[PDB]
């Protein structure tokens, strides 16, 4: 299926990975604490990403999940976040939220 790639550059995910974590569809707008709006697409798996920092639950858009910033391994452009369950009774235990503007093609 169609690959989604780093816009700046590297395949990051494919459309086959896309799922709806919550009922707001697979991609919705979320607001960060400083007024940046991120159209965040939820995919089960992503490749070619490096993580920055430790996981945090602060202002998590997906309650029960911690986020870790994720960037392109090639150009270091911000791509999204890895989300990791804080409890065992959640499913999935991990996924990625990718910001729409960081990916090509444009969805």
């Amino acid at each position: 299926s169609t690959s989604l790639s780093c816009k700046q550059c590297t395949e990051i995910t494919t459309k086959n990975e896309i799922f709806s974590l919550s009922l707001s569809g697979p991609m919705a707008a979320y607001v960060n604490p400083h007024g940046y709006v991120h159209e965040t697409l939820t995919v089960y798996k992503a490749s070619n990403l490096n993580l920055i920092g430790r996981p945090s639950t602060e202002h998590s858009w997906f309650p029960g999940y911690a986020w870790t910033v994720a960037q392109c391994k090639i150009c270091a452009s911000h791509i999204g976040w890895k989300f990791t369950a804080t409890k065992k009774d959640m499913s999935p235990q991990k996924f990625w939220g990718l910001t729409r503007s960081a990916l090509l093609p444009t969805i």
């Binding site: 960060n32 604490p33 400083h34 986020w67 910001t99």
Partner: peptide, 27 residues
């Protein structure tokens, strides 16, 4: 442990210089 923060995405750094490089990439 990482007190320099990017308010666009939540990225945090130990070195101010790495925050500066990070911010540049958002442009």
């Amino acid at each position: 442990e990482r007190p320099f923060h990017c308010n666009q995405c939540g990225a945090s750094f130990t070195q101010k210089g790495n925050l500066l490089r990070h911010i540049k990439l958002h442009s």
